[PDB]
Amino acid sequence: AVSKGFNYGATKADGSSKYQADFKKDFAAAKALVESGFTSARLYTMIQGGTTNTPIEAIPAAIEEKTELLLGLWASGGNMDNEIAALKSAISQYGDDFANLVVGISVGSEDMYRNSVTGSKSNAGPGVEPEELVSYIQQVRSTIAGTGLSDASIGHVDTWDSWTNSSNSDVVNHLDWLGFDGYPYYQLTMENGIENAKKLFDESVEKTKSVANGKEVWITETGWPVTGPQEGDATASPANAKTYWDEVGCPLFGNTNTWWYMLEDEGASPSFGVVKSDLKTPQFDLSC
Ligand SMILES: *[C@@H]1O[C@H](CO)[C@@H](O[C@@H]2O[C@H](CO)[C@@H](O[C@@H]3O[C@H](CO[C@H]4O[C@H](CO[C@H]5O[C@H](CO)[C@@H](O)[C@H](O)[C@@H]5O)[C@@H](O)[C@H](O[C@H]5O[C@H](CO)[C@@H](O)[C@H](O)[C@@H]5O)[C@@H]4O)[C@@H](O)[C@H](O[C@H]4O[C@H](CO)[C@@H](O)[C@H](O)[C@@H]4O)[C@@H]3O)[C@H](O)[C@H]2NC(C)=O)[C@H](O)[C@H]1NC(C)=O
């Protein structure tokens, strides 16, 4: 089966922690957009907001909503010990009802991009060197071996330019699949108006595939904002977000594993959410 879902943070746009009831309402609202629906959820961390290493409360919400989970461990900033502890506790506390929903586990999100020259200046925090990322991948594989998650596939999420950076080549060799992050909206060194969005997306995916050594490339993050500042030639608007949804999203949905960015984020700038904060009014026509 092909995964179709959304990316979800551990906090709300204002930075406050999300709890089980918040995740449950999101997962249910995503299902209620199309009656092959959005039934999957990608997370960036195993750790509940406001805690040191308590399992994120998205897990019990997903069990109740039967939501598929693409788990994430955050690998930058030296906190993998707590991520691994939370993963161990999640397996222990929630058992098979949890394991049965897990489609894969991503070790790190954009850690190689933050360890690049332009990524350093993004002020998104520190990154991780390829060798340490490989060691983290091996630690997670050891952690799930023998457990209910022993059949979950291990990947990593990063930008297409970090995948194509040949110094990062050994990371690919330790993964089961590659997670693609790419936004033509942010590619301001190119002619990145909405006019060129599909071309730029397709080109970046083909670049990632060229270094994937025949392993699957999942679309773990892309989207186009409805409001926000102009980036090069790219402008945020409901019309432009709609055009990107139609040109890039509709051909992916149900064909390539895809997690859109994102369901809802009112208050954030740029705002990438496709539904308003009532979790019912779409920002544009979502039919394909
Ligand atoms: C293509 O990809 C490659 C590889 O991914 C990428 O190359 C990296 O480029 C980035 C950006 O320029 C470099 O990051 C800088 O690294 C500076 C040096 O610190 C690093 O190197 C230290 C020494 O490394 C050698 O020695 C040790 C000990 O002998 C050995 O273990 C190593 O393997 C290596 O041989 C190393 O000690 C240091 O470790 C610290 O940081 C890591 C980060 O995860 C963390 O574990 C700890 O905090 C640890 O103390 C680190 O690995 C560094 O000074 C510099 O920091 C600047 O930026 C940050 C913010 O971004 C500021 O906070 C800071 O004040 C500085 O302004 C930055 O981190 C990295 O070294 C390259 N890696 C390699 C392998 O070459 C290319 O850029 C990519 N190409 C393009 C075009 O983007």
Numbering used by the authors: 0 to 34, 37 to 289
The paper states:
To provide new insight into the glucan metabolism in the Penicillium genus, we focused on two enzymes (named G9376 and G7048) that have been previously identified in the culture filtrate of P. sumatraense AQ67100 fed with C. vulgaris biomass. On the other hand, in contrast to its predicted function, G7048 acts as a 1,3-β-transglucanase active on 1,3-β-glucan oligomers with a degree of polymerization (DP) higher than 5. Enzymatic analyses revealed that G7048 acts as a 1,3-β-transglucanase, rather than a glucanase as inferred by predictions, creating branched-glucans. The antagonizing activity between G9376 and G7048 suggests how opportunistic species belonging to Penicillium genus may feed on substrates with a composition similar to their own cell wall without incurring in self-deleterious autohydrolysis.
Moreover, since this region has been predicted to bind a glycosylphosphatidylinositol (GPI) tail for the anchoring of G7048 to the cell membrane, we decided to express a truncated variant of the protein encompassing the first 308 residues (hereafter referred to as ΔG7048). The X-ray crystallographic structure of the catalytic domain of G7048, solved at 1.9 Å of resolution, consists of a (β/α)8 TIM-barrel fold characteristic of all the GH17 family members. The catalytic site is in a V-shaped cleft containing the two conserved catalytic glutamic residues. An important feature of ΔG7048 is the absence of the so-called “subdomain” in the proximity of the helix α6, which is present in other glycoside hydrolase of the GH17 family and has been proposed to provide subsites + 3, + 4 and + 5 for substrate binding in 1,3-β-glucanase. Notably, ΔG7048 shares this peculiar feature with RmBgt17A, a protein belonging to the GH17 family, which acts as a β-1,3-glucanosyltransferase. Moreover, albeit ΔG7048 and RmBgt17A share a low amino acid identity (29%), both the catalytic glutamic residues (E111 and E222) and several aromatic residues pointed out by Qin and colleagues as involved in direct substrate binding in RmBgt17A are conserved or conservatively mutated in ΔG7048. Structural and mutagenesis studies have identified three of these residues (Y102, W157, and E158 in RmBgt17A) as crucial for transglycosylation activity toward hydrolytic activity. In the ΔG7048 structure, their topological position is occupied by the residues Y114 (Y102), Y187 (W157), and Q188 (E158) which are likely to fulfill the same proposed role in the stabilization of the transition state at subsite − 1, + 1 and + 2 during the transglycosylation reaction step. In the ΔG7048 structure, their topological position is occupied by W161, D162, Q188 and S205 which, together with the structural elements in regions 2 and 3 are likely to create a similar steric hindrance.
